[PDB]
Design a binder for this molecule. Structure first.
Ligand code: MOO
Ligand SMILES: [Mg+2]
Length: 314
């Protein structure tokens, strides 16, 4: 009824567990509000607003740059950066060769004929493009130009090209992506890969460390030089770029999650309160307790007057 406001929050799949907690905390403080959350790969999440005509009060992505590239200036005009993450290679203890995989031999294990691994669709999800970026960055770190070629290029129509030191991968439209089902499985968002690994269909999957911890997966920590986790290695991460099917270019960058309130949000006032919760000490703790490092202090890419005291604007 008129005493039941619905705050619509569309978010990155990897924010599914934190969002359950933000929803419960928010509703405890606003008993007449139902936070309606929906998970999807970040680019698909943004398209709900930018292409499907749906209205969301809050958009949260796993890569803040997608808000900038896909929503400015028609649907948003600021982004707050509030959390970080790290790419790892996760598995079950009964996954093929789980007893022998480690940080030094991970790519050789994935190269074994009977081993199947997964990553999400780069056109829809940052985890997916980040997975390909990490594998290509591995060629530089391990000084082995064939790692991406053997793992991905020979099992799909996805290929990195070199252009004066940097490498670029141009994505086919999603409908034209070709995958060798004998080695790889892909899904629209990384969270969808979880059940494939749990059922035994996949042995390993590239995923965020926070999600691996939340879902009880073991994992190999990849070198900081390739795992996109540290601001201090931004110069190395920038050596790889992926051009999504929608034409937007994403460059390897330290993983930083973004949140915004779309310009056409129906319940802006409540959305401001929700964003405040996410970047408050309470929200930082919710993230930390769920195995995801919050960005402290939160930052904004431009002035955000309604939240000036909560953010650092450079
Ligand atoms: O936007 Mo994801 O958390 O890389 O589904
Ligand atoms: Mg190569």
């Amino acid at each position: 009824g008129h005493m039941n406001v619905k705050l619509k929050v569309f978010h990155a799949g990897s924010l599914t567990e934190p969002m359950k907690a933000f929803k419960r905390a928010f509703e405890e403080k606003h008993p007449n509000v139902e936070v309606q959350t929906e998970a999807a790969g970040s680019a698909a999440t943004i398209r709900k607003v930018t292409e499907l005509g749906r209205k969301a009060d809050v958009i949260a992505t796993a890569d803040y740059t997608l808000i900038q590239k896909m929503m400015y200036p028609e649907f948003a005009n600021w982004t707050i950066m509030f959390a970080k993450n790290q790419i790892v290679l996760a598995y079950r203890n009964d996954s093929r060769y789980a007893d022998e995989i480690n940080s030094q031999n991970w790519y050789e294990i994935l190269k074994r004929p009977d081993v199947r691994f997964g990553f999400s669709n780069p056109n829809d999800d940052p985890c997916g493009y980040r997975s390909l970026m990490a594998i290509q960055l591995a060629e530089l770190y391990y000084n082995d130009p064939t790692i991406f070629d053997e793992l991905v290029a020979k099992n799909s129509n996805l290929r990195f090209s070199e252009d004066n030191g940097s490498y670029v991968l141009r994505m086919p439209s999603s409908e034209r992506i070709e995958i060798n089902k004998s080695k790889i499985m892909i899904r629209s968002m990384e969270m969808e890969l979880i059940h494939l690994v749990e059922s035994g269909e996949l042995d390993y999957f590239f995923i965020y460390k926070s999600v691996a911890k939340q879902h009880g997966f073991n994992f190999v920590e990849l070198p900081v030089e390739i795992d996109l986790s540290s601001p201090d290695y931004a110069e190395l991460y920038s050596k790889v770029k992926v051009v999504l099917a929608n034409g937007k270019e994403v460059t390897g960058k330290p993983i930083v999650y973004g949140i915004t309130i779309p310009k056409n949000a129906e319940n802006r006032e409540l959305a401001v309160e929700f964003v405040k919760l996410v970047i408050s000490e309470e929200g930082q703790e919710i993230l930390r307790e769920l195995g995801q490092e919050p960005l402290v202090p939160p930052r904004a890419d431009t002035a955000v007057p309604s939240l000036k005291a909560m953010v650092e604007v450079s």
